[PDB]
Amino acid sequence: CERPPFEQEQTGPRGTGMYVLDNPRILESRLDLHTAPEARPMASEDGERAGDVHENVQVLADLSDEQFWRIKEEMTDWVAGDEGCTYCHTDDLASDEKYQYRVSRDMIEMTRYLNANWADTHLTHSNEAGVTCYTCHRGEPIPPASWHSEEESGETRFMTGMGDLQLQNKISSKTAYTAFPRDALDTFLVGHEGELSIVGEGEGGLRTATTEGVSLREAYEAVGLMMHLSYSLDAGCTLCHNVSRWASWEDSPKERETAWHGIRMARDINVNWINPLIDEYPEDADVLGPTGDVGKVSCQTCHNKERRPLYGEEFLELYPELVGEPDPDFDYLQFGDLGTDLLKGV
Amino acid sequence: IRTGLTDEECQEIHEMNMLGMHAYWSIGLIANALAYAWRPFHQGRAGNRLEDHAPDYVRSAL
Amino acid sequence: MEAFYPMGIARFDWGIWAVIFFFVFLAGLIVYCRREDKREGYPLISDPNDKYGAPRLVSGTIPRVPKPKTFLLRDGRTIQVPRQEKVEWDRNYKLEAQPTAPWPGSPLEPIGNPMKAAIGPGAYAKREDKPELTWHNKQKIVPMRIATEYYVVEDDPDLRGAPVVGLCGGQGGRVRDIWVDRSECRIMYYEVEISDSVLLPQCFARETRRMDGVWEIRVNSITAEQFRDVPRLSNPDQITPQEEDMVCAYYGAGTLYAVPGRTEPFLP
Amino acid sequence: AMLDFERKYRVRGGTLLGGDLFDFWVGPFYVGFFGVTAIFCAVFGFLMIGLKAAISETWSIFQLVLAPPNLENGFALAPLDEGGLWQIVTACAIGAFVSWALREVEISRKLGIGYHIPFAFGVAISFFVLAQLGRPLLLGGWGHAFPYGIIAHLDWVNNVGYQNLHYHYHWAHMLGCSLFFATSFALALHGGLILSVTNPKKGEVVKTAEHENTFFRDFVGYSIGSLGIHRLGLALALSTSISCIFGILTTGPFWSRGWPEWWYTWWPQIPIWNW
Amino acid sequence: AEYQNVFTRVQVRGPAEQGLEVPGGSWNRVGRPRFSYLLGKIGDAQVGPIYLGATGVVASLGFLIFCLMVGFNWLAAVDWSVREVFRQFWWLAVEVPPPEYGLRIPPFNDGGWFLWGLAICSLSLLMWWARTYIRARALGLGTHVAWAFAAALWFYFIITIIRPVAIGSWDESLPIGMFAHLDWLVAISERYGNFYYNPFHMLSIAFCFGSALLFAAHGATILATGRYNSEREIEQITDRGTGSERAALFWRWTMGFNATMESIHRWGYWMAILVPLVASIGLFLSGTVIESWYEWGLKHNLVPIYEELSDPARNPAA
Amino acid sequence: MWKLWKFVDFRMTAVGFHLFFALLAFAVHFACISSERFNWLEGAPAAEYYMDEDPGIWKRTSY
Amino acid sequence: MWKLWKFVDFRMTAVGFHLFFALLAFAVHFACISSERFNWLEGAPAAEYYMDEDPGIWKRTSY
Ligand code: A1LZM
Ligand code: A1LZM
Ligand SMILES: C/C=C1/c2cc3[nH]c4c(c3C)C(=O)[C@H](C(=O)OC)c4c3nc(cc4[nH]c(cc(n2)[C@@H]1C)c(C(C)=O)c4C)[C@@H](C)[C@@H]3CCC(=O)OC/C=C(/C)CCC[C@H](C)CC/C=C(\C)CCCC(C)C
Ligand code: HEC
């Protein structure tokens, strides 16, 4: 049971039903979850480089000592949780014995990449927000909305037996608690062969001799991913669509376009940054998923049931040390749409 | 409840019933024997999965 | 206006062509249903209250009035709908009313007492004057004094002897017996003795439990006095469809004519 | 132009409001004052629909819509080009539906029949009123009510359903779809039964109520009967309209998340199986 | 107020009627007729006897086999936990084959169980339809109820078999699940444009909304005219009474036209059975002839065009 | 049991057995198709084609 | 139990028992199908093929 009033956002023409209702009491109850911690004061760029006053500093080498300490303290406040410095550090602070140390090194690289390359298309839609460690982790070692491959895609299939739901027909937040395919996050936010443009076009709306569409199962998977998108942003389908015409981008609110990039960005995050971490993890780590996979990034990982992560708090100027240099060959169409050039390993 | 059929009517019904039941039964036994000789229905302790016996290039739906 | 092989050309596609075919079938189906509608009351008759004569060709023929349908009945009779006895009954129906105005569509105000006029809500159709039987030739609508096998269920009030009150609360009578439908297993009528016996249709009777714990029948349609004018049964122990129809029509007459007010609006 | 038996019932009286001035018939239609007001509201509302067709240059019954004002408009009167025409037509539709139901009350009084038909129509009217008033009151503006377009109100239904992600899973939608399907199922069964009794194979006599009772007793073990089938049918259709009221008044006002998430919120956590 | 004919305040019970004589009725009519007083409030109290025919018994058995196949699959899907079956009752389903099989019957757990259950359920539904026909015929009735069920079953076979076969893929068929078949609704409508733009969807909803309209109006009409024994409609058809006259005149004075006691049932019968028929037409054209109902209705000036958005979303993939 | 027709309607029994055997023939044929080994429609090889010894059914074979 | 048919209808008893045993035969065959060990259509190996000794049922074996 919910209750009026609601924060309403009319995302389309009047009378079309294109609007989003957001519960103010629910956002108030999730205020602790949806607000980043108070930022530390800005650190000066003048001083000895962190790679000179510390033995094993590579990713943050170009940082000043003060900026280094600021970002280290913030990362402790964002990912370490109640473990503090020991979360990633042994007694020796220059030793990468814990997988958390090296994973956090790759995570600093990934956050820099995201703030340098995905800000123009996705991470600064409303505010110059970008992402920090807290955007996904929310103060915890494991991002609460990190996802693993479902414990049905990795299991051995009893092909002639009973009870195979085909990654559907089960309760899952990954599909916004629909019976839609639960491996849609793997299909689209990791895999690149998945087709999200499932709505038929034809010619004149007709299955012309040249008309080839997607299967109904592909429609199931895409609608499941879209359920995940709606769940993650705490909005309905109308946030990014006149549902009457899903294929029509001209009839869709601007948030669809950025959502598109988010899809690709998630793929980027999962393909070039999250999955290659499996080497760093221990073979029998309890953090790994049932299929022995590292938790991937979905829409919900940053949009923890929120339209814009951390209430769109600005971090690009606030944490320049988490903003890297733009990738010279960055292209949002090279993540499974115009090609797979920027998805390393696939 | 009583069907009202006489003993002779019940006996001709049962003659036909025995004919149909046992003819279908024998035909089905022959059919199952033929299908069993074609491929025994029940696997041995080794099983009869292709993955356990066929080379790797023999695709198995299992 | 491209060709869309094999799905058509321009808008001449098979989405729209199955649409057109189904609308053609739906139009034919509506025409068929309208013809079936015209099996009663058709051919239409113009309003006799008219300063002009009747046009030679009458309304209600765009879907043609179909050939009369033949029904074979259990009693061996072959009836033809529209049943001409009903049509002649309507033709020769005593009105006891005059049009309010000289134009067609004018309502009929009854000349005298509208309870006895059998006009409007008191109007009734011509029906069979032989009592209807069940499939086993048993009297279909029968009092429980004859059909002793039928009983009021334990959880429900047995109103034999219960008071029957009229619109104004006056004592119309007492329930002598309950008439049930053998086929429907429902109460059709309450036989109400008046201190002579009349019948009270079950839908015209409200079995109300008084706060005394005493059950009574409240009859909103007619008053206690008007119970004396309910059409009687030709045979006390059986009712024909015609008598059922007369009694129900009398109570329907009461629904509009029992008291002077109920035929008048809130604000005229 | 009048049924063979119609004149026998065409009497004065039975008006709720109108007296004898409006108490007449034009052709088959009884008029009454509520018929006059129903025609007024209907024709004026259709003229406002045509006005929107003119100002929007949309002379297509399918593409033309009178949409309610924007959400930011609230309950304010809108410009006729910004939802005011929808407000006028909403008043017209409420008035026309109420006048039609009241004319049916008048006709029922004149025929001595019960008011069940105007009551059922009033249940449908109650859906329309609670959808076009109750939903604006719950959500804070006329813009949350559905628009007046043959196809465009389907788009509104689509978008309002997809606002809660998967509208099929709505409890009121599940109940009401079951009720519509049961209503069509029971109408098919009932029409089929009555026609089967009165239209057996050629040469067979018309069957009875005993025949239809034993037909459904043999068929499904229970026969609801002549009275029971009509009571159940009125109940099924009415209850589906009440389910429509609850669905249109709860999606958004009483659940802004997905109805899948609504089902997940309680059903899997029911303690008899949440362990 | 007046009695509203909503509930039977006083129920009368006769001897439990076993039923009119039919061939095989003495044996195949089973169950001591039980009287439900709660059911007697609305309609007939008598429950039973039911005809234990060959088609009826084997159709019920096949329905049970289908339901138990579905339940066993749900159990095996939740590790044979009845607790988890009930916890996930609405989500769980016997899923259809994936598209890579096309029309091939796949292994059980790759949609083969769905096709197995489809065969069992379809055969059981056909045996139940045969029971409908034969129960009508044994009583000397028309087979109108059987043909209404035939319209519903034709739509069912379009949903499950005929249209998946015409499309050439079993994944187009309806999954056997509470929430899964609603997800099939969503997937079909959105994959093939939008069924809101499907005119056979429009007509089927018109006929379903009008089944509700006609059956509300007709039940209300019969309850209103029950003062004149209009609920005994067979008599009002063969021997037209004042109740049927008043019903016709109510609807003629309201709408300008009416029905008869028989023709209102013709109207309702056709309005109901048209829902699955034009439903089957529209669903079948979705995926065989029509790829997008939105694009098709755009070509036919059926789909509304709304105000162009300020700052529309532009497809980043051109 | 020739006396069964004194108490069981043979018409029901025979017609119902025919209906249930149509249903069961579909069920069993579909079960065979759903099996790789027994899907003659797909025609997969038998493991006996690749086994050098007879697997048996009750033969107490060991790896 | 020969007097049971004085009080219990053998019609419904026999019909319901045949219907229930058809349903139960399907249920039991489903239970076998769902079992890797017992699915003959899958044809999975028995674990006894790989055990070096008799597992028993009540044998009270120890690791
Ligand atoms: C995505 C999204 C979606 C959706 C959406 C949604 C929302 C939002 C909603 C809804 C609804 C529902 N639906 Mg649906 N859907 C889906 C689907 C479906 C299906 C399948 C198959 O799938 C099915 C079967 C279904 C059905 C249903 C039902 C039940 C309901 C409807 C009905 C109504 O309402 O009307 C109701 C209505 C009413 C009552 C109406 C009334 C008039 C008025 C007075 C009268 C007068 C008028 C006039 C004009 C006059 C004329 C003249 C002449 C002509 C001269 N679904 C999807 C999913 N949904 C509602 C509710 O809730 O209920 C519960 C709401 O709200
Ligand atoms: C792959 C493939 C396959 C098949 C095939 C087919 C088709 C297609 C069909 C069939 C059938 C039929 N089968 Mg057969 N099968 C199969 C197996 C079997 C079995 C097992 C054991 O496994 C059985 C028992 C059967 C049986 C039968 C019957 C019951 C029916 C009828 C026929 C007759 O009569 O015969 C006749 C009869 C007969 C053959 C039978 C008798 C007793 C015997 C001596 C003894 C018993 C034993 C046991 C159970 C235990 C052992 C096992 C273990 C594990 C060692 N099937 C496979 C799996 N199919 C049909 C039907 O359903 O009808 C409706 C059809 O259509
Ligand atoms: C639970 C019970 C139910 C029930 C019951 C029942 N409905 C009855 C009766 C009974 C007992 C009648 O007795 C009465 C009658 O005479 O015909 C049989 C009637 C009727 N309903 C009609 C339409 C109907 N009803 C539907 C639903 C149910 N109807 C539910 C299921 C549905 C849908 C969508 O499901 C439809 C389209 C007409 C044909 C007729 C009214 C005419 C009128 O209002 O006059 C008035 C005359 C006219 C011409 C009205 C015009 C008024 C405005 C200004 C015109 C503009 C129209 C709108 C703004 C509406 C929104 C447009 C949409 C595109 C968004
Ligand atoms: C994981 C998320 C970490 C937390 C929490 C903290 N530290 Fe860390 N630290 C981490 C990495 C991956 C690195 C390497 C940085 C690089 O650019 O490669 C570091 C680095 C340091 C260093 C310098 C290492 C050296 O060469 O001596 C120090 C001194 C250090 N970190 C201290 C430190 C303290 C005090 C923390 C708690 C407040 C802390 N770190 C948190 C990973 C993580």
Ligand code: HEC
């Ligand atoms: C979202 C895009 C993320 C941002 C931004 C950062 N991290 Fe992350 N991190 C993310 C995921 C999905 C995961 C996997 C969680 C799982 O389920 O396994 C991680 C993992 C880490 C870890 C290891 C967690 C553990 O196993 O204990 C660390 C130490 C970590 N991330 C650190 C980290 C830092 C320091 C970041 C900012 C510079 C950072 N992450 C950003 C998702 C995202």
Ligand code: HEC
């Ligand atoms: C973290 C790395 C993110 C992931 C993964 C996804 N999104 Fe995102 N999104 C993120 C940020 C930091 C922002 C900017 C917030 C701001 O205030 O500017 C966004 C923005 C959006 C928006 C626009 C929201 C708005 O301002 O109206 C949308 C619609 C959106 N994101 C959708 C989206 C989807 C659909 C994703 C998964 C496929 C997704 N995002 C992933 C951070 C991150």
Ligand SMILES: [Fe+3]
């Ligand atoms: Fe009826």
